[PDB]
């Protein structure tokens with residue numbers, strides 16, 4: 184047998200507790216990632232459909248097209264099906280691309296199927312998220328090496344919300360003319376007029392996902408929109424909620440994404456993806472990702488807050504997830520990911536420090552969004568770096584060709600380069616773009632909450648503005664932008680406000696002294712090309 188994921192971290196993350204051994208007779212649901220075909224061909228098709236210089240630009244695959252391409256061989260399907268049925272799998276589901284298969288097993292059956300697996304219950308975080316995972320590595324038969332990439336639900340823990348304290352209520356002697364960031368502030372700064380809203384006359388649509396154990400509240404959105412939405416046409420309900428069953432407590436992150444996607448992309452049909460509630464063998468992100476490939480008609484724009492440390496992931500998992508992002512890019516979906524909230528990050532390895540990139544932010548196949556702030560508090564002038572803004576260089580994926588010029592220019596030109604030991608100059612660099620990330624208002628459980636901060640905020644803002652641009656494209660009879668990066672870099676970030684002041688954070692240590700990369704003229708790995716000036720950016724994304 185062999186371990187498919189020797190290099191997946193299995194360590195118990197902070198704020199989690201091991202509760203007990205799972206009962207042999209408990210049932211759990213494990214997702215099996217099956218061996219795809221024609222993946223190299225898929226990468227060629229993506230290169231073509233996303234390159235604005237190609238005759239094939241915008242000619243995206245249907246989900247049917249993708250499935251016909253990448254779906255596993257008959258041998259793979261038959262070998263895995265026989266293998267699972269034998270072990271006692273039940274109530275399995277697949278997806279249209281046929282490259283995921285999820286099945287219920289008993290804990291006993293599962294630990295026979297996957298020798299080494301030892302399932303325990305864990306709880307984590309302020310809302311007591313529950314999972315069942317193995318601290319021990321697992322093995323597959325050699326006969327499955329050709330057929331199975333990995334088994335979801337074994338190791339990787341879902342995200343839990345920070346216990347970091349926001350600023351307390353307080354007096355000042357300047358209570359401001361206006362505290363913090365609201366929809367009005369966003370739309371003013373990025374030059375959306377009141378006319379800059381969806382018309383509902385196409386079937387343009389957009390989507391956000393996050394993966395903390397929090398529930399979406401339509402009531403909070405309604406209140407948010409009454410508070411903040413007075414001066415632009417808006418919708419006060421989502422078009423669809425995917426993944427949420429039952430009633431439960433709202434949270435800041437689950438409020439932020441929707442409330443501000445629907446402010447930046449106003450009067451556009453919006454989905455929410457939101458799977459709180461018990462599914463202990465599911466990984467939340469993998470579930471979401473798998474399910475993209477199970478629905479043919481999707482929103483064009485998806486704004487996603489999710490990250491691990493890149494180094495924590497198995498090769499098997501990270502490479503497969505990257506292929507799933509490729510599949511989405513082949514279909515003309517624009518997937519945006521928050522760049523992270525720890526700057527360049529900090530990783531202690533081999534007695535030393537280096538930067539710590541995150542994934543999927545590091546995927547060459549997503550638009551990754553960093554964070555800016557204003558210089559003075561009250562006042563919506565020029566943008567600078569928000570110190571938390573995630574960025575840096577992959578240790579896994581090589582610099583994609585579409586950022587060769589931009590990155591080489593930065594590396595050759597930047598007067599503030601960190602020590603070379605701290606980063607991988609060869610790697611995919613991010614972010615690609617940026618928006619405000621400091622001091623948002625949300626409504627959660629019917630309470631307005633200020634000082635909400637992070638690239639989780641910037642990300643739905645940037646996405647909404649893209650979704651409004653798509654509305655223009657679609658009404659004029661053109662395909663949506665889809666995978667944006669090739670075009671954006673080819674166009675040297677035209678239409679974006681170039682962020683040139685400030686650096687993001689890193690190790691508080693004797694060498695880099697709390698700073699990672701610095702922003703500069705043009706593309707940098709703190710803010711990318713920078714922030715959306717709508718009317719200017721719109722002009723650059725109309726033809727082709």
Ligand SMILES: *[C@@H]1O[C@H](CO)[C@@H](O)[C@H](O)[C@H]1NC(C)=O
Nearest residue numbers: 276277278279285473474477
């Ligand atoms: C995919 O979609 C079909 C509904 O069309 C459903 O029956 C199936 O269970 C879905 N797959 C998964 C893994 O959820």
Ligand SMILES: *[C@@H]1O[C@H](CO)[C@@H](O)[C@H](O)[C@H]1NC(C)=O
Nearest residue numbers: 380381382383384416417450
């Ligand atoms: C907003 O969209 C709705 C359809 O959902 C449409 O009736 C309305 O005209 C739109 N408002 C504007 C200002 O385009």
Ligand SMILES: *[C@@H]1O[C@H](CO)[C@@H](O)[C@H](O)[C@H]1NC(C)=O
Nearest residue numbers: 578579580581582607609610
């Ligand atoms: C540096 O990045 C490249 C990808 O461009 C990768 O192949 C290599 O493993 C990385 N180095 C380390 C030490 O991870």
Ligand SMILES: *[C@@H]1O[C@H](CO)[C@@H](O)[C@H](O)[C@H]1NC(C)=O
Nearest residue numbers: 372373374679680714715716
């Ligand atoms: C919004 O437009 C004004 C010009 O009226 C410009 O000063 C500002 O930079 C624009 N916003 C962005 C983000 O470029």
Ligand SMILES: [Ca+2]
Nearest residue numbers: 682703704705
């Ligand atoms: Ca810059």
